[PDB]
From Swiss-Prot, chain D:
Residues the record lists as N6-acetyllysine modifications: K127, K176
InterPro entries in the cross-refs: Ntn_hydrolases_N (IPR029055), Proteasome_alpha (IPR050115), Proteasome_alpha-type (IPR023332), Proteasome_asu_N (IPR000426), Proteasome_bsu_CS (IPR016050), Proteasome_sua/b (IPR001353)
Residues recorded with modification Phosphoserine: S13, S75, S173
Main location (coarse class): cytoplasm
Tissue: Ubiquitous.
GO CC annotations on file: cytoplasm; cytosol; nucleoplasm; nucleus; P-body; proteasome complex; proteasome core complex; proteasome core complex, alpha-subunit complex
Identification of the protein by name: Proteasome subunit alpha type-4
Task performed by this protein: Component of the 20S core proteasome complex involved in the proteolytic degradation of most intracellular proteins. This complex plays numerous essential roles within the cell by associating with different regulatory particles. Associated with two 19S regulatory particles, forms the 26S proteasome and thus participates in the ATP-dependent degradation of ubiquitinated proteins.
Source organism of the structure: Rattus norvegicus (Rat)
Swiss-Prot/TrEMBL keywords: Acetylation, Cytoplasm, Nucleus, Phosphoprotein, Proteasome
Compartments reported by the entry: Cytoplasm; Nucleus
Swiss-Prot record, chain E:
This protein's record includes keyword Cytoplasm: yes
Record-level Gene Ontology MF annotations: endopeptidase activity; peptidase activity; threonine-type endopeptidase activity
Protein name (database record): Proteasome subunit beta type-5
Family: Belongs to the peptidase T1B family.
Gene: Psmb5
Catalytic activity of the protein: Cleavage of peptide bonds with very broad specificity
Induction comment from the UniProt entry of this chain: Down-regulated by theophylline (THP) and up-regulated by 1,3-dinitrobenzene (DNB), two reprotoxic agents thought to induce infertility.
Binding site for bortezomib: A49
Annotated organism of origin: Rattus norvegicus
E.C. no: 3.4.25.1
Annotated S-S bridges: none
Subunit organization: The 26S proteasome consists of a 20S proteasome core and two 19S regulatory subunits. The 20S proteasome core is a barrel-shaped complex made of 28 subunits that are arranged in four stacked rings. The two outer rings are each formed by seven alpha subunits, and the two inner rings are formed by seven beta subunits. The proteolytic activity is exerted by three beta-subunits PSMB5, PSMB6 and PSMB7. Directly interacts with POMP. Interacts with ABCB1 and TAP1.
From Swiss-Prot, chain F:
GO biological process entries: proteasome-mediated ubiquitin-dependent protein catabolic process
Subunit structure: The 26S proteasome consists of a 20S proteasome core and two 19S regulatory subunits. The 20S proteasome core is a barrel-shaped complex made of 28 subunits that are arranged in four stacked rings. The two outer rings are each formed by seven alpha subunits, and the two inner rings are formed by seven beta subunits. The proteolytic activity is exerted by three beta-subunits PSMB5, PSMB6 and PSMB7. PSMA5 interacts directly with the PSMG1-PSMG2 heterodimer which promotes 20S proteasome assembly.
GO cellular component: cytoplasm; nucleus; proteasome complex; proteasome core complex; proteasome core complex, alpha-subunit complex
SUPFAM superfamilies referenced in this protein's UniProt entry, alphabetically: N-terminal nucleophile aminohydrolases (Ntn hydrolases)
Protein name: Proteasome subunit alpha type-5
UniProt xrefs under NCBIfam families: PRK03996.1
Signal peptide: none
Modified sites of kind Phosphothreonine: T47
Cellular location(s): Cytoplasm; Nucleus
Pfam families: Proteasome, Proteasome_A_N
Glycosylation sites noted in the Swiss-Prot or TrEMBL record: S190
Family: Belongs to the peptidase T1A family.
SMART domains: Proteasome_A_N
From Swiss-Prot, chain H:
Main location group: cytoplasm
Molecular function (Gene Ontology), one example: ubiquitin protein ligase binding
Gene: Psma3
Organism superkingdom: Eukaryota
Name of the molecule in the record: Proteasome subunit alpha type-3
A GO CC term attached to the entry: proteasome complex
Modified residues (Phosphoserine): S243
């Protein structure tokens, strides 16, 4: 999508939806775009300890650099201190690495997905530019604004005159993973092949593949 | 007629100075009063004008270096020479097409020789002179100054002349400012005059 | 910083040979007393060694590190003159002071200078070519709170707040002579602080107010080094007074 | 080994001061003397060369007094060897400050900057401090006519008449005795300069070959630094005969 | 002054209000973008220009304010934060950076505000506005204004200025974040929604 | 010089063994870890009644939530604190969490032995440090007191005292204190050993006490609040 | 195609992984521009005795990747334990160096196929010059990506258990399309098989196309 | 040999009055105490044999090693102080790797032998480093220049060798290599011949049992330095026991 | 004297006296046992404390969640090598992405610790590391000395009279590979007591346990989280 200077094609669109107990981060599985699709497997998602899992998406080259870098940080906080790297500690940490990718320019958006010690389940967007914030609905990857809208209606439910929230259930999120990617396939066939759904309850990672026909 | 607008006229027993207060972001003056007149001493005054931001960075680096001369000798440095000295440093920076060029106005009193005033362009030219102004404001006053006064003219007439000049900027110039600071210098020191 | 032996080797005393040797090197920069007033914090130095073929500026133990922090030096000994080794601590101290003005533009703090200096001396130990220091400074200056400060530092790396401290010719001895002279009136009255500094210097030096040069520094105004001639006028009255407290 | 020696260069000694700094002053004592005297409209330097030989060709007419700048002058008191390095550092500093400043270089400013290098070596680097005390004469507007004295100890001094090199204690008093504060004019001062050099030398008899005399006199719009040719100094050597009478009387 | 990322000083507090989105991309950058982040309690630095520029500057700032405070054991002034912020930022500046950040603290004469930019501005102010275009925000803010100005006027002014911005300039989302910054301890005041306050005031 | 590589045939440095003797002449510091805080006590060393306790401290801030009280040679403590302060503030931007009391103690401990007569750099030395530091602060694992010593070892302690007699000041502390107890009893326990080991006896300008609770910032105590802790010795 | 900044090119590298073996087919025809400079060239390198490399994309950029590869095996031998690399570490370490090399104006879409079994770990890796590196069933990049990879992948998706024989007839067929479509070669290939115990590769032998595209 | 512990070795830049530093003489003495490591050049390769010390039955190949591959075609057999031998292997590994990047061919040993011998002499020169305390052999099979065997002493002399041994008895082993003609041999026969000499030469006063570990860079390892193949190892092992008897 | 503090004076055996002192430094330090299996690696180290009102200092240090180290000797010297081992392993993980072999890492450490032994006027370090790691081949316990010399062992014990611990280890050498994570610790405990007097056995709060693998992430057991691994020991096998 993004200009050649670290790319010639990468695609991959990710959606992630916050309930208030689980966060499922769904991404298409396949490594695509050049002019055709290169490969059918690749691990975008990595759990650094058991309590933080990052999934980085867009170019598979950026994803391989940034994820290993996210593993490195967990080792740095354990050695330096003695602790397990929580959600906040990782989210903040990603920004230091992200500083590098501002004169370089990227549209690879890495998303740390976990449970935070604030009483809820968390999905964090740091932008690939910099900045970090927490959110109730989010679209991240090669377009950071094409997945985003479906979640805006379904999760947030701020459609009165005013803004009042009302997160959805776990069962509603699973169906949201399966459906979104098929919808996005119509629009941009850069979400294709197989849908990989990762579920993070912030104390475990589980995976589900499903083929797309 | 160069960049931003400043004017100072020494009569060699008085110095008349006014400078704009306006570090403008977009189309509003985020504050009304803004410092463009800096005091290195109570008997040296530097009025820097050009870029809002560039004026400040240039002044502070030289200012710790100025202090260093004061620290060692524990008497006054040669102030005329120090305002030239920064200029020589800006001649080395001038070969580079980067803009760091400052239109400066030195008012200083030196001990032994007397008062010195030096003019600095954005093309960088040191002159002791009867009155000089920087940017558009040089343009505004230089032509009346031969005719309407002398280089020994009275403080009253100077001030009336200055008031009118600042009103001509609001009236004629595309750069008006409704806050200008006026300061009057006798033969040795700064007095803060009424804002207009 | 290049040598081929260690600069110091440790002892089971728990003293550093080079810091103690340095303390004598700083009493080369003769006796300095400083007292803290309500609004004028004043320090004065011993010997200007006047022969009216010299300049007064060049021998100074009073050094301007900034235009709102100043210091006078010594510590303990009785050893020979030389401004120079002390002068070198000043040259480091003046950068240290100036770098802080870049960082915080308000009148820079006394505390910063003293702390930087203690650590600076330990650091020189570590480098084999670098000569350590061990000095005391009478740091005078003002905060951004406008309140008077007089701080003093020691070769032991430790800095304390004080209302009056003197250093030179026995650090504890000039300090104790001031402890007697101190009363509660002294520090608020502007006039009274000046007389304290002159009685302490007048002890070790003959015919002061030519060998007493003192500077007052102010909340609003920078360093003013007074002419010696106006100081002599004080010395004559004050020496009358000095015998009285004894 | 290297760990079983002493020389106490960077290491402080029992004295509280380094051996190397104190020793440098002894070397300066038995080497040719340099004095600077104040006049009302100039300043001058007079020096005894390090050559005690009876035959000089004058290849370099600066063998003691080197004119750095058109605004400044120096003398060497000590070993000519450490002077050679120092002379080259001085031609650069003196001209650099001037490029910026556009005002005749202040005598004080120069010495404090230089003294900092002299002390840098003794404290660190494991090098000894230069065996040369340099006598600077110059003029700036805000002190007036000046003479400043430089040491290997990093000590500076503001003077009006001083002498360093051989038999210095005698020499400074002798300059004070003949010449008070602000007394003597430039021409009469040049005579005085030779008179003290005749008396104080490492080896007697004062000749044109043994002396070099330099003038700072402010000419019409420029401050002119000249080292006088042998011919001019000779007219001063007869003047110095006249001067001996004059001091006494 | 600019956007709606705004602060001005009163007699007692610095009243700081900001919008969600005003950054890059045609949609929302983040749906719940906050620019009154609390990495420390002392005084916000506003969100000037690019998101990367102030934020990058801020990890440095959050670390730097503390270092001064901890070592002297006497707090940093609005001036110590202006000078400190200006020296670190000039050097970093040259990657196409520029911000409009805010050194604040209560000093000797009430609240002091010094306006610092990434190109090294140091100007003294009592109002700052960061982002792009305050011209819709400014008029209603002005009527009852002065350099030191009471809390009652400050409530009336602050409520209309934010509200009016919403009506006139529309592109935000979510809620209008209001925080008040004393010279040592900021607190997040209220989170009233941007659409809710706009009709009301 | 005379050997600074000096090993005994047992297998430790002579120089390190020499380093303790310096601590013994210096100042006295008590750190006690409580469930309800960390209290830090330190000798101010009065010697005039003109030295102001509010203006000057020797309980100093590593972070706004972490304190360190120093003992032994004063110059030596300052060098360790300045490197540790920056490490701590840099940590705060990056992680966005307070630094563990253990995390800061490990960094300083590297500096203690690295000496050698020649090939020295800033990371190395010409003689080992003779200061022991009590780093006390409250973190997310709770209130912790970690102790760093001249041998450059870090140990968790719920009570440590180091001063005029290091082992002596720790033996008084072993008799009084109990592991889990209230803040007032921990603050009392710190003062009590302090006056007995020292030549100097307990006053309110003689010693400096500042207390860090969890859920609080580092507070350096006011003139009055310093005097309140003196009533119970 | 798909190849910014190339001069001497290796056109196409087949890589398909089967159970314990890989077959890679690469042409001997090595065009220096349009002209086939070398009619036979072995584009098979020996990383190690237990590893093998086969590469496609610009051949000059391949010799660069070769010098970097070469040293990594040296490092492992270098210890004295005398270990043979793992396919993932050598390929992966270089993927990072391809992230750095983008910024300067030389471009790389360099593509290598690593199959090894060494130490006790079985890798199939592909490493790129843009640094898309992954484990795979079958991969090829650059010019391989534009034309053979999708037919190879289409068969690979419902039958993920293709064998080296079914792939052999397919390799021969696809290269027939390369002689005709690509302007960097006219046929002739080297068949290289990497195993996890020895590196095997019979020398480049001619092959020739079959005509039937002038009937209609 | 000259050396006294007082004088002319109290800095590593002090030249001795005899023309050869005391420190280099000390470095050779350590090689003389250690076990025998042999490497004989063949017509079709080089065969190494170094005895690997076993002090416990807990030890694997990693413990008490003396075969390094400087390159991956060039081998290094060391004898003497192991601590300096392994450090010089690490710098050497780097030096070989940089050469391969630039040059791009199986390195000729003749160039290595000059550069390494000069590096070993450099450490005698300099104060911040002291001489290397081992003598080592560098051995390779290449097609660029064939079989090559060089030995470098801790002095920093490089000489060329047909077959050298370094140990507790350097002279007896070299006469024994002289008797046999490697001219008649191919690389296969040489493996037998290295194996016996190691057992006889070495005198137990510090061992307790050793394991012979040998390495090929020859015909059945194709110009890269691999550990001995199994067939070759067994042929070699029997003859060594038979030679004792 | 001063010819034994010179790093440029050697014995007629060709041993520098400063390297010899540096090995002994380990030996005065507390005993640590490091064992491997074919799924795990266990580090058992003996603790110390200053007081009864204190918890014991972990002698197991945290590097990564796949490699871990245990120290015996000087902590401050330890910390410089520790900063070096953390820097190299993390490097390996970013660039190569291989869960680094133990065998490559120790050899580079061997190079560094060798540098002060060659330097004039600089002392060797004198801490002993038993580095436990897990790579894809399986676990290895390598022991690196204050000299270059490093060992690849199934089990090793270093410290006071460490030769005696090796004997227990040698009798159960084969068993280690079959045994479980839990047992590997118990066999470690039984070795660790041989070093110390037979007048004394271990206790719960002087044992620190560090477990390594990639079937588990790195754990440090302190003074009271030690107990589950501890149960099952034999009092002084002779």
């Amino acid at each position: 999508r993004f200009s050649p200077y670290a790319f010639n094609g990468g695609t991959v669109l990710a959606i992630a939806g916050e309930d208030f107990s689980i966060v499922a981060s769904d991404t298409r599985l396949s490594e695509g775009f050049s002019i055709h699709t290169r490969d059918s497997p690749k691990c975008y998602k990595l759990t650094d300890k058991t309590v933080i899992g990052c999934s980085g998406f867009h170019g598979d080259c950026l994803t391989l650099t940034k994820i290993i870098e996210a593993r490195l940080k967990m080792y740095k906080h354990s050695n330096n201190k003695a602790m397990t790297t929580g959600a906040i500690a990782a989210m903040l940490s990603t920004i230091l690495y992200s500083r590098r990718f501002f004169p370089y320019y990227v549209y690879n958006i890495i998303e740390g997905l976990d449970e935070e010690g604030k009483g809820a389940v968390y999905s964090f967007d740091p932008v690939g530019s910099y900045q970090r914030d927490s959110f109730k609905a989010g679209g991240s990857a090669s377009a950071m604004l094409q997945p985003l809208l479906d979640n805006q209606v379904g999760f947030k439910n701020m459609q009165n005159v005013e803004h009042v929230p009302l997160t959805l259930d776990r069962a509603m999120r699973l169906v949201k993973d399966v459906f979104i990617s098929a919808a996005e396939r119509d629009v941009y066939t850069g979400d294709a092949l197989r849908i990989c759904i990762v579920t993070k309850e912030g104390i475990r990672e589980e995976t589900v593949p499903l083929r797309k026909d | 007629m160069e960049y931003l607008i400043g004017i100072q006229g020494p009569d060699y027993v008085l110095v008349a100075s006014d400078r704009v207060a306006a570090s403008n972001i977009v189309q509003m003056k985020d504050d009304h009063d803004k410092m463009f007149k800096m005091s290195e001493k109570i008997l040296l005054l530097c009025v820097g004008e050009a870029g809002d931001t560039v004026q400040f960075a240039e002044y502070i680096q030289k200012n710790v270096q100025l202090y260093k001369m004061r620290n060692g000798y524990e008497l006054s440095p040669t102030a005329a020479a120090n305002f030239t000295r920064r200029n020589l440093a800006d001649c080395l920076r001038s070969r580079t097409p980067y803009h760091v060029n400052l239109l400066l106005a030195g008012y200083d009193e030196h001990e032994g020789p007397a008062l010195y005033y030096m003019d600095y362009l954005a093309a960088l030219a040191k002159a002791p002179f009867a009155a000089h102004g920087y940017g558009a404001f040089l343009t505004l006053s230089i032509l009346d100054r031969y005719y309407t006064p002398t280089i020994s003219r009275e403080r009253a007439v100077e001030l009336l002349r200055k008031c009118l000049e600042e009103l001509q900027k609001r009236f004629i110039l595309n750069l008006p400012t409704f806050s200008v600071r006026v300061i009057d210098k006798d033969g040795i020191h700064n007095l803060e005059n009424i804002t207009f | 910083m290049s040598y081929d032996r260690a600069i110091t080797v440790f002892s089971p005393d728990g003293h550093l040979f080079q810091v103690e040797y340095a303390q004598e090197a700083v009493k080369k920069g003769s006796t300095a007393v400083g007292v803290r007033g309500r609004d004028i914090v004043v320090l004065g130095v011993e010997k200007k060694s006047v022969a009216k073929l010299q300049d007064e500026r060049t021998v100074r133990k009073i050094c301007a590190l900034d235009d709102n922090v100043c210091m006078a030096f010594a510590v303990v000994a009785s050893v020979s003159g030389l401004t120079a080794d002390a002068r070198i601590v000043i040259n480091r101290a003046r950068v240290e002071c100036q770098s802080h003005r870049l960082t915080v533009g308000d009148p820079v703090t006394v505390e910063y200078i003293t702390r930087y200096i203690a650590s600076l001396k330990q650091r020189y130990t570590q480098s084999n070519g670098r000569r350590p220091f061990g000095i005391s400074a009478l740091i005078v200056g003002f905060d951004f709170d406008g309140t008077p400060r007089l701080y003093q530092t020691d070769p032991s790396g430790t800095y304390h707040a004080w209302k009056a401290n003197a250093i030179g010719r026995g650090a504890k001895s000039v300090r104790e002579f001031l402890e007697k002279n101190y009363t509660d009136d002294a520090i608020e009255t502007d006039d009274l602080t000046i007389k304290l500094v002159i009685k302490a210097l007048l002890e070790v030096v003959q015919s002061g107010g030519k060998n007493i040069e003192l500077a007052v520094m102010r909340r609003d105004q920078p360093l003013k080094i007074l002419s010696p001639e106006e100081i002599e006028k004080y010395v004559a009255e004050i020496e009358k007074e000095k015998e009285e407290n004894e | 080994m290297s760990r079983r020696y002493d020389s106490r260069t960077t290491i402080f000694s029992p004295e509280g001061r380094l051996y190397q700094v104190e020793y440098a002053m002894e070397a300066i004592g038995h080497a040719g003397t340099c004095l600077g005297i104040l006049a009302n409209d100039g300043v001058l330097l007079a020096a005894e060369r390090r050559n005690i030989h009876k035959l000089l060709d004058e290849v370099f007419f600066s063998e003691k007094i080197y004119k750095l700048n058109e605004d400044m002058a120096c003398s060497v008191a000590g070993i000519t060897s450490d002077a050679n390095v120092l002379t080259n550092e001085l031609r650069l500093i003196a001209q650099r400050y001037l490029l910026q400043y556009q005002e005749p270089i202040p005598c004080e400013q120069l010495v404090t900057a230089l003294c900092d290098i002299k002390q840098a070596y003794t404290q660190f680097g494991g090098k000894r401090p230069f065996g040369v005390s340099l006598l600077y004469i110059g003029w700036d507007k805000h002190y007036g006519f000046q003479l400043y004295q430089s040491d290997p100890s990093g000590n500076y001094g503001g003077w009006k008449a001083t002498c360093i090199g051989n038999n210095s204690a005698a020499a400074v008093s002798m300059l004070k005795q003949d010449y008070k504060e602000g007394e003597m004019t430039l021409k009469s001062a040049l005579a005085l300069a030779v008179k003290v050099l005749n008396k104080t030398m490492d080896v007697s008899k004062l000749s044109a070959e043994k002396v070099e005399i330099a003038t700072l006199t402010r000419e019409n719009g420029k401050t002119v630094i000249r080292v006088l040719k042998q011919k001019e100094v000779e007219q001063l050597i007869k003047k110095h005969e006249e001067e001996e009478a004059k001091a006494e009387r | 002054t600019t956007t709606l990322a705004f602060k001005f000083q009163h007699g007692v507090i610095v009243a700081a209000d900001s919008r969600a989105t005003a950054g890059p991309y045609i949609a929302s950058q983040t749906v719940k973008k906050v620019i009154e982040i609390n990495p420390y309690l002392l005084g916000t630095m506003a969100g000037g220009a690019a998101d990367c520029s102030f934020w990058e500057r801020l990890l440095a700032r959050q670390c730097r304010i503390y270092e001064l405070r901890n070592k002297e054991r006497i707090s940093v002034a609005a001036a110590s934060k202006l000078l400190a912020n200006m020296v670190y930022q000039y050097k970093g500046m040259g990657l196409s950076m520029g911000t409009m950040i805010c050194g604040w603290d209560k000093r000797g004469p009430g609240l002091y505000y010094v306006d610092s930019e990434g190109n090294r501005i140091s100007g003294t102010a009592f109002s700052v506005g960061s982002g792009s275009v305050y011209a819709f925000g400014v008029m209603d803010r002005g009527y009852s204004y002065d350099l030191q100005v009471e809390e009652a006027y400050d409530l009336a002014r602050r409520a209309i200025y934010q509200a009016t911005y919403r009506d006139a300039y529309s592109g935000g989302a979510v809620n209008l974040y209001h925080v008040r910054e004393d010279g040592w301890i900021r607190v997040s005041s209220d989170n009233v929604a941007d659409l809710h306050d706009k009709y009301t005031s | 010089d005379r050997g600074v590589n000096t090993f005994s045939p047992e297998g430790r440095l002579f120089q390190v063994e020499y380093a303790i003797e310096g601590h013994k002449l210096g100042s006295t510091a008590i750190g006690i870890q409580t469930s309800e805080g960390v209290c830090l006590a330190v000798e101010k060393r009065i010697t005039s009644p003109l030295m102001e306790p509010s203006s000057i401290e020797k309980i100093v801030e590593i972070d706004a939530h972490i304190g360190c009280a120093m003992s032994g040679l004063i110059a030596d403590a300052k060098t360790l604190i300045d490197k540790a302060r920056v490490e701590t503030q840099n940590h705060w931007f990056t992680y966005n969490e307070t630094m563990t009391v253990e995390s800061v103690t490990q960094a300083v401990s590297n500096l203690a032995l690295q000496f050698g007569e020649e090939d020295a750099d800033p990371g190395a030395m010409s003689r080992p440090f003779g200061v022991a530091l009590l780093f006390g602060g409250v973190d997310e694992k709770g209130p912790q007191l970690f102790h760093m010593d001249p041998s450059g070892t870090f140990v968790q302690c719920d009570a440590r005292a180091i001063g005029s007699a290091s082992e002596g000041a720790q033996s008084s502390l072993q008799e009084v204190y109990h592991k889990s107890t209230t803040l007032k009893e921990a603050i009392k326990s710190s003062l009590i050993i302090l006056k007995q080991v020292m030549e100097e006896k307990l006053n309110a300008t003689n010693i400096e006490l500042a207390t860090v609770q969890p859920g609080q910032n580092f507070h350096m105590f006011t003139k009055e609040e310093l005097e309140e802790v003196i009533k119970d010795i | 195609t798909q190849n910014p900044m190339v001069t001497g090119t290796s056109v196409l590298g087949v890589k398909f992984d089967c159970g314990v073996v890989i077959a890679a087919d690469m042409l001997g025809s090595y065009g220096s521009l349009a002209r086939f400079r070398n009619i036979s060239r072995i584009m098979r390198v020996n990383d190690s005795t237990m590893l093998g490399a086969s590469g496609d994309y610009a051949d000059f950029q391949y010799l660069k990747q070769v010098l970097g590869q070469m040293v990594i095996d040296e490092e492992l031998f270098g210890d004295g334990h005398s270990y043979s690399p793992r396919a993932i570490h050598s390929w992966l370490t270089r993927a990072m160096y391809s992230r750095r090399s983008k910024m300067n104006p030389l471009w790389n879409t360099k593509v290598i196929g690593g199959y090894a079994g060494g130490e006790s770990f079985l890798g199939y890796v592909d490493m790129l010059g843009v640094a898309y590196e992954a484990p795979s069933l079958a991969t090829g990049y650059g010019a391989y990506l534009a034309q053979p990879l999708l037919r190879e992948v289409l068969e690979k998706q419902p039958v993920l258990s293709q064998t080296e024989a079914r792939e052999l007839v397919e390799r021969c067929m696809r290269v027939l399309y390369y002689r005709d479509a690509r302007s960097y070669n006219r046929f002739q290939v080297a068949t290289v098989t990497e195993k996890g115990v020895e590196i095997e590769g019979p020398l480049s032998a001619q092959t020739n196309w079959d005509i039937a595209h002038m009937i209609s | 040999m000259s050396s006294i512990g007082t004088g002319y070795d109290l800095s590593a830049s002090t030249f001795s009055p005899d023309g050869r530093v005391f420190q280099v003489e000390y470095a050779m003495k350590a090689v003389e105490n250690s076990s025998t490591a042999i490497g004989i050049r063949c017509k079709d390769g080089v065969v190494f044999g170094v005895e690997k010390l076993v002090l416990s039955k807990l030890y694997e190949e990693g413990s008490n090693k003396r075969l390094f591959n400087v390159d991956r075609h060039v081998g290094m057999a060391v004898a003497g102080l192991l601590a300096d031998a392994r450090s010089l292997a690490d710098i050497a590994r780097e030096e070989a790797s940089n050469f391969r990047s630039n040059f791009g061919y199986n390195i000729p040993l003749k160039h290595l032998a000059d550069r390494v011998a000069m590096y070993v002499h450099a450490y005698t020169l300099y104060s911040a480093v002291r001489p290397f305390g081992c003598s080592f052999m560098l051995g390779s099979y290449s097609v660029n220049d064939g079989a090559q065997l060089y030995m470098i002493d801790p002095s920093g002399v490089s000489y060329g060798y047909w077959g050298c041994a370094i140990g507790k008895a350097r002279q007896a082993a070299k006469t024994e290599i002289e008797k046999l003609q490697m001219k008649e041999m191919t690389c296969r026969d040489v493996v037998k011949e290295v194996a016996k000499i190691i057992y006889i030469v070495h005198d137990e006063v510090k061992d307790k049992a050793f394991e012979l570990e040998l390495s090929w860079v020859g015909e059945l390892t194709k110009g890269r330095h691999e550990i001995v193949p199994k067939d070759v190892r067994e042929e070699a092992e029997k003859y060594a026991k038979e030679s004792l008897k | 004297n001063q010819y034994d503090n010179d790093v440029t004076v050697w014995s007629p055996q060709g041993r520098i006296h400063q390297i010899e002192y540096a090995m002994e430094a380990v030996k005065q330090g507390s005993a640590t046992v490091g064992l491997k299996s074919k799924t795990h690696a266990v580090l058992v180290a003996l603790k110390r404390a200053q007081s009864e009102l204190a918890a014991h200092q972990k002698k197991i240090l945290h590097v990564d969640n796949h490699i871990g180290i245990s120290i015996a000797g000087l902590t401050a010297d330890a910390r410089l090598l520790c900063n070096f081992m953390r820097q190299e392993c993390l490097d390996s993980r970013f660039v190569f992405d291989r869960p680094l072999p133990v065998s490559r890492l120790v050899s580079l450490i061997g190079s560094k610790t060798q540098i002060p032994t060659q330097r004039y006027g600089r002392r060797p370090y004198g801490v002993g590391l038993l580095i436990a790691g897990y790579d894809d081949m399986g676990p290895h316990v390598f022991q690196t000395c204050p000299s270059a010399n490093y060992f690849d062992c199934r089990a090793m014990s270093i410290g006071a009279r460490s030769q005696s611990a090796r004997t227990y280890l040698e009798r159960h050498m084969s068993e280690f590979m079959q045994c479980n994570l839990d047992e590997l610790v118990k066999h470690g405990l039984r070795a660790l007591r041989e070093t110390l007097p037979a007048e004394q056995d271990l206790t719960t709060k002087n044992v620190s346990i560090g477990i390594v693998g990639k079937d588990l992430e790195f754990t440090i057991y302190d003074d009271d989280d030690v107990s589950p691994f501890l149960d099952g020991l034999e009092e002084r096998p002779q």
